[PDB]
Amino acid sequence: TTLGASIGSTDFHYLQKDYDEIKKLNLNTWNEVAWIGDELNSKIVMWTNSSPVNNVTLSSSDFINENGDLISSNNIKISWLKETLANIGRSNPSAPLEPFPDIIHNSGSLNIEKNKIASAWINIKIPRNAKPGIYNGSIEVTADELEKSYTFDYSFEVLNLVQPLPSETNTQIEFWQHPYTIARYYKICKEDLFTEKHFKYLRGNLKEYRNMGGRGVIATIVHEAWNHQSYDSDPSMIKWRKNSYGTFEFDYSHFDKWIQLNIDLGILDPEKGFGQIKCYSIVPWNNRIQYFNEATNKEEAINPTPGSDLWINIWTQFLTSFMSHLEEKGWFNITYISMDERSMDDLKACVDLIENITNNSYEHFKISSAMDYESGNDYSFLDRIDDISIGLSHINHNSDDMKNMATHRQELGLLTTIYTCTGDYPSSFTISDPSEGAFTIWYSLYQNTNGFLRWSWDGWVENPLENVSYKYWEPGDPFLIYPAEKDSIGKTFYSTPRLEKLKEGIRDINKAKYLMEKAPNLKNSIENLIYSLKRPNKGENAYGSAVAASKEDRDLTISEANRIKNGINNFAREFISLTM
Ligand SMILES: [Br-]
Ligand SMILES: [Br-]
Ligand SMILES: [Br-]
Ligand SMILES: [Br-]
Ligand SMILES: [Br-]
Ligand SMILES: [Br-]
Ligand SMILES: [Br-]
Ligand SMILES: [Br-]
Ligand SMILES: [Br-]
Ligand SMILES: [Br-]
Ligand SMILES: [Br-]
Ligand SMILES: [Br-]
Ligand SMILES: [Br-]
Ligand SMILES: [Br-]
Ligand SMILES: [Br-]
Ligand SMILES: [Br-]
Ligand SMILES: [Br-]
Ligand SMILES: [Br-]
Ligand SMILES: [Br-]
Ligand SMILES: [Br-]
Ligand SMILES: [Br-]
Ligand SMILES: [Br-]
Ligand SMILES: [Br-]
Ligand SMILES: [Br-]
Ligand SMILES: [Br-]
Ligand SMILES: [Br-]
Ligand SMILES: [Br-]
Ligand SMILES: [Br-]
Ligand SMILES: [Br-]
Ligand SMILES: [Br-]
Ligand SMILES: [Br-]
Ligand SMILES: [Br-]
Ligand SMILES: [Br-]
Ligand SMILES: [Br-]
Ligand SMILES: [Br-]
Ligand SMILES: [Br-]
Ligand SMILES: [Br-]
Ligand SMILES: [Br-]
Ligand SMILES: [Br-]
Ligand SMILES: [Br-]
Ligand SMILES: [Br-]
Ligand SMILES: [Br-]
Ligand SMILES: [Br-]
Ligand SMILES: [Br-]
Ligand SMILES: [Br-]
Ligand SMILES: [Br-]
Ligand SMILES: [Br-]
Ligand SMILES: [Br-]
Ligand SMILES: [Br-]
Ligand SMILES: [Br-]
Ligand SMILES: [Br-]
Ligand SMILES: [Br-]
Ligand SMILES: [Br-]
Ligand SMILES: [Br-]
Ligand SMILES: [Br-]
Ligand SMILES: [Br-]
Ligand SMILES: [Br-]
Ligand SMILES: [Br-]
Ligand SMILES: [Br-]
Ligand SMILES: [Br-]
Ligand SMILES: [Br-]
Ligand SMILES: [Br-]
Ligand SMILES: [Br-]
Ligand SMILES: [Br-]
Ligand SMILES: [Br-]
Ligand SMILES: [Br-]
Ligand SMILES: [Br-]
Ligand SMILES: [Br-]
Ligand SMILES: [Br-]
Ligand SMILES: [Br-]
Ligand SMILES: [Br-]
Ligand SMILES: [Br-]
C-alpha cells in the first residue's frame, strides 16, 4: 500500500507516534446531523509506507437529498492539517518537543514523506435556505502513486429548524485580542499602528471571531497591564501623561481606532447596546501605572494601593475623563471597567470608587471581572459586578452552588461566563483533545451561565507555525488561531481543531437554548438532559501539563458531548413533529 486512508474523528489528534495503530483503520462511511444554516466537520487520516507519495488531493462531490435538492460542493472546504512542534510541558524547558496537527492549513495538494501520518480537515456549511432531508455525497482521495483512488461515502441529515445567527442568541463569548502582537508578527511599524496597513491583518480574524459569536472586546487602559506575561508586550491603548499642574492627561488615539474597527466590523454596536468594551484594568499588575512626566521629561511609575487617597485621586482623574470621552463618542453604555483576581479589599475599593463616579444621567461604569467564586449564596458583592467569569478549576461539580449563583444573575440580567486557562482540564491547548472545547461550552450551559471567556485569541510566540513553545503554560494556551505565513499574500490567519470544537459547542448550546425558548412542553426535559452531564477528573503529564486523570476520564469528555448533542437533536425532531 503506497497510501492508506480512513475516515477519522475530529475529537482527538492523529499523531505520528501512533502510526502503527492508525494504519489499522478502515472506516469508509460517515453520517451526522445538522440544522439548516449549521456546519459539520469531519476528517480523513492518511498514511504512507516505505515510499513518499506526491500530489495527494481530496475532492468533494455535490450533496443531494432524496428530492434532488442540492447543497453545492461550493459549501465544502477540505484543508490539510499542518503540524507544528510543541514542548509538551509547562514551564519545563527540558520537556520533549513533539509534533501536533493543530493548524487547519490550506486546500489543494500535499506531498507526504515516507512512513508518515497526514490528515485533512473537512468542513461542510449548510446554507441558511437549505431544504431538510438526508443528503448523500462523496469525497475522493487521489495521488500520483496511487493506482486506485479512495471514495468515502458521506451523508448528513438536515433537520427542519434554522441554526440561530449569533446575534439572535443570548450566548456570551469573549476572547482577548492582542492587536499589537498581530502588528509585530506582520512587521507593522509603530507609525502604521491602527492604520489600514494594520487593519488588513486584523479584519479576517476579527470577522472569524464575530461570526462564531464573539461579543467582548478587550482594550488596555494602562501600560503593560499584565507585567509582560506574554511573548509580546501589552502596550496601553490609552497613553498617560502628567503635566506641570501635576494632573493627568490622556491620549485615546489607539483605543479609538481599535474600538471603531470593531464597530465597523459589527462586533460592537453601542447604539444598539450590543457587545462589550472591556477595559483592562483598574487593578493592573501590582497596581502599577506608568506615565510620561512632562515636568521632568521622563517616564515615571506609581503603584498606589487601592482605596488610598492617592489611588482615589488618580483613578477619579482617569475615570471621569474617560467617561466624558466615551460619552462624546456614544460608546459609554457598552463600556466595562475590568478588575481581576485580586484581594477582596482591593476589589471592594474598586467597586466603591466606580459606583461613586456618575455621568449627568446618574449612570456609573459597568464592571467586569474574573472572580474566584466557589460556594455559598451571599451574592451581595457579586451583584455589583455586571459581568463575571469563573474559572473551571474553581467550580465544584458535586454542588449546585455555581448554578444557583448564575441563575440569580440571569434573573437580574447580569452576565456570567466560565473560563479555562493554564492548569485546567478540559481545556484548549495544542496538546488537548479538540473535543475538550465542545465539552467546555456544554459545561457553560450545565452551570446556567451565558457562555465562555478565554484570554487567548491570538497571543502568538515568534513563529508558531513551526514551534508554539513558550516559557509559561501548556503549549498553545495563549492563542486559538495561528497567523498565516509572514509573507502570505492572501490568508492572514489559520483556524485550529480546538477552536472549531469551541464553535461546534457554541452552535450546539445555541440549539439547546433555542428549543428551551421555543418549545415549552420540552424545556424541563431539555434542562434535565443538560443537567445529567458528567465531568472528567484531571491529572498531569510528567512535564507539568494538565491532562485527563485516566483513559476513562478522557473518553468521557467525548462521549458526554456526543450524548448531549444527540439528545438535543432528538428533542429537535420532537419539536419539528409537533410543529408539523
Ligand atoms: Br497499510
Ligand atoms: Br471515527
Ligand atoms: Br467519526
Ligand atoms: Br500513544
Ligand atoms: Br486510532
Ligand atoms: Br465502513
Ligand atoms: Br450527530
Ligand atoms: Br511500511
Ligand atoms: Br472540495
Ligand atoms: Br476544497
Ligand atoms: Br476549512
Ligand atoms: Br512539525
Ligand atoms: Br502530552
Ligand atoms: Br534544559
Ligand atoms: Br524533565
Ligand atoms: Br514523536
Ligand atoms: Br487554499
Ligand atoms: Br521521503
Ligand atoms: Br454561533
Ligand atoms: Br495599506
Ligand atoms: Br481586508
Ligand atoms: Br476580510
Ligand atoms: Br459557528
Ligand atoms: Br498579572
Ligand atoms: Br507577573
Ligand atoms: Br505603542
Ligand atoms: Br502609557
Ligand atoms: Br485629557
Ligand atoms: Br485623543
Ligand atoms: Br493613531
Ligand atoms: Br477613530
Ligand atoms: Br473597516
Ligand atoms: Br470593516
Ligand atoms: Br450583548
Ligand atoms: Br497583583
Ligand atoms: Br512596581
Ligand atoms: Br508611558
Ligand atoms: Br524615559
Ligand atoms: Br519612577
Ligand atoms: Br518607569
Ligand atoms: Br512602581
Ligand atoms: Br502621582
Ligand atoms: Br505610590
Ligand atoms: Br490614604
Ligand atoms: Br492625594
Ligand atoms: Br477629575
Ligand atoms: Br460625563
Ligand atoms: Br463633561
Ligand atoms: Br453613551
Ligand atoms: Br471611594
Ligand atoms: Br467571590
Ligand atoms: Br446560608
Ligand atoms: Br458588598
Ligand atoms: Br463575593
Ligand atoms: Br481545582
Ligand atoms: Br480544571
Ligand atoms: Br443563556
Ligand atoms: Br520564550
Ligand atoms: Br507557568
Ligand atoms: Br516576510
Ligand atoms: Br483571511
Ligand atoms: Br434564539
Ligand atoms: Br412545546
Ligand atoms: Br409535547
Ligand atoms: Br422526555
Ligand atoms: Br460526574
Ligand atoms: Br508524559
Ligand atoms: Br489518558
Ligand atoms: Br489514553
Ligand atoms: Br462517543
Ligand atoms: Br446527533
Ligand atoms: Br413539542
**Which among 369, 407, 372 has a CA at the least distance from the CA of 388?**
369
**Which among 372, 385, 378, 483 has a CA at the least distance from the CA of 418?**
372
Distance CA 511, CA 445 (A): 11
Distance CA 273, CA 327 (A): 14
**What Å resolution does this PDB entry report?**
1.5
Q: How far is the CA of 245 from the centre of ligand 55 (A)?
A: 50
CA 495 to mean position of chain CA atoms? 11
Q: What is the dihedral of CA 253, 256, 262, 263, to 10 degrees?
A: -150
CA 519 to mean position of chain CA atoms? 29
3-state secondary structure (DSSP) of residue 135:
strand
By the CB criterion, residues less than 5 angstroms from ion ligand 38 are 298-299
Give me 13's grid cell: 489528534
Give Cα separations from 303 to 285, 306, 347, 351, 446 (angstroms). Answer: 9, 9, 16, 18, 40
Show the CA angle centred on residue 170, arms to residues 518 and 325, nearest 5°. 150
Indicate which ligand has the atom closest to the C-alpha of 565.
71
Q: How far is the CA of 343 from the centre of ligand 20 (A)?
A: 45
Contacts of 131 (CB under 8 A, 6+ apart): 65, 67, 69, 158
Distance CA 236, CA 11 (A): 38
Q: How far is the CA of 49 from the centre of ligand 32 (A)?
A: 49
Give me 5's grid cell: 486512508
Q: Is residue 260 packed enough to be buried (19+ CB in 10 Å), middle (13-18) or exposed (0-12)? A: middle
DSSP string, 321-380: HHHHHHHHHT-GGGEEEE--S--HHHHHHHHHHHHH-B-TTS-BPEEEEEE---S-S--T
**Which among 531, 532, 549 has a CA at the least distance from the CA of 540?**
549
Q: Look at the chain and count its residues.
A: 580
Give me 450's grid cell: 451565558
By the CB criterion, residues less than 5 angstroms from ion ligand 18 are 52, 113-114
**Which among 323, 379, 381 has a CA at the least distance from the CA of 351?**
381
Largest pairwise CA distance in the chain = 82
Distance CA 23, CA 46 (A): 8
Structural element, H or E, at residue 531: none
Residues tagged in the binding site annotation: 169-170, 215, 229, 421-422, 477
Please give the single-letter amino acid code of residue 126.
I
**Which among 442, 393, 388, 385 has a CA at the least distance from the CA of 416?**
388
- The radius of gyration of the chain's CA atoms, rounded to the nearest angstrom, is 25
Contacts of 129 (CB under 8 A, 6+ apart): 36
Q: How far is the CA of 509 from the centre of ligand 19 (A)?
A: 9
Indicate which ligand has the atom closest to the C-alpha of 360.
47
**Which among 254, 174, 36, 220 has a CA at the least distance from the CA of 506?**
174
CA 66 to mean position of chain CA atoms? 37
By the CB criterion, residues less than 5 angstroms from ion ligand 10 are 77-78, 107
By the CB criterion, residues less than 5 angstroms from ion ligand 9 are 60, 76, 78
Class of domain 3-162: mainly beta
Distance CA 103, CA 240 (A): 39
Give me 292's grid cell: 510620561
Q: How far is the CA of 318 from the centre of ligand 29 (A)?
A: 13
Show the CA angle centred on residue 435, arms to residues 526 and 523, nearest 5°. 5
Q: How far is the CA of 105 from the centre of ligand 49 (A)?
A: 42
Q: How far is the CA of 200 from the centre of ligand 20 (A)?
A: 7
**Do the beta carbons of residue 8 and residue 28 sit within 8 Å?**
no
Please give the single-letter amino acid code of residue 572.
A
Give me 431's grid cell: 496538546
**Do the beta carbons of residue 127 and residue 135 sit within 8 Å?**
no
Distance CA 78, CA 421 (A): 30
Contacts of 460 (CB under 8 A, 6+ apart): 181, 182, 185, 231, 232, 478, 479, 482, 483
Long-range CB contacts (within 8 A, 24+) of 97-100: 97/467, 97/469, 98/15, 98/16, 98/17, 99/15, 99/16, 100/13, 100/15, 100/430, 100/431, 100/475
Asked whether the CA dihedral 495, 496, 499, 505 is positive or negative, the reply is: positive
Give me 17's grid cell: 507516534
Per DSSP, what are the bridge partners of residue 99? 85
Distance CA 402, CA 399 (A): 7
Residues tagged in the binding site annotation for N-acetyl-D-galactosamine: 169-170, 215, 229, 421-422, 477
Q: What are residue 535's phi and psi, to 5 degrees?
A: -120, 125
**Do the beta carbons of residue 86 and residue 467 sit within 8 Å?**
yes
By the CB criterion, residues less than 5 angstroms from ion ligand 55 are 393
Q: How far is the CA of 454 from the centre of ligand 29 (A)?
A: 29
DSSP string, 172-226: EEEE---HHHHHHHTT--GGGTTSHHHHHHHHHHHHHHHHTTEEEEEEE-STTTT
Q: How far is the CA of 335 from the centre of ligand 44 (A)?
A: 28
Contacts of 43 (CB under 8 A, 6+ apart): 7, 8, 9, 10, 14, 81, 119, 120, 121, 122
Structural element, H or E, at residue 161: strand 150-162
Distance CA 457, CA 130 (A): 32
**Do the beta carbons of residue 38 and residue 127 sit within 8 Å?**
no
Q: How far is the CA of 521 from the centre of ligand 64 (A)?
A: 5
Q: How far is the CA of 425 from the centre of ligand 69 (A)?
A: 14
3-state secondary structure (DSSP) of residue 74:
helix
Indicate which ligand has the atom closest to the C-alpha of 286.
35
3-state secondary structure (DSSP) of residue 537:
coil
**Do the beta carbons of residue 468 and residue 461 sit within 8 Å?**
yes
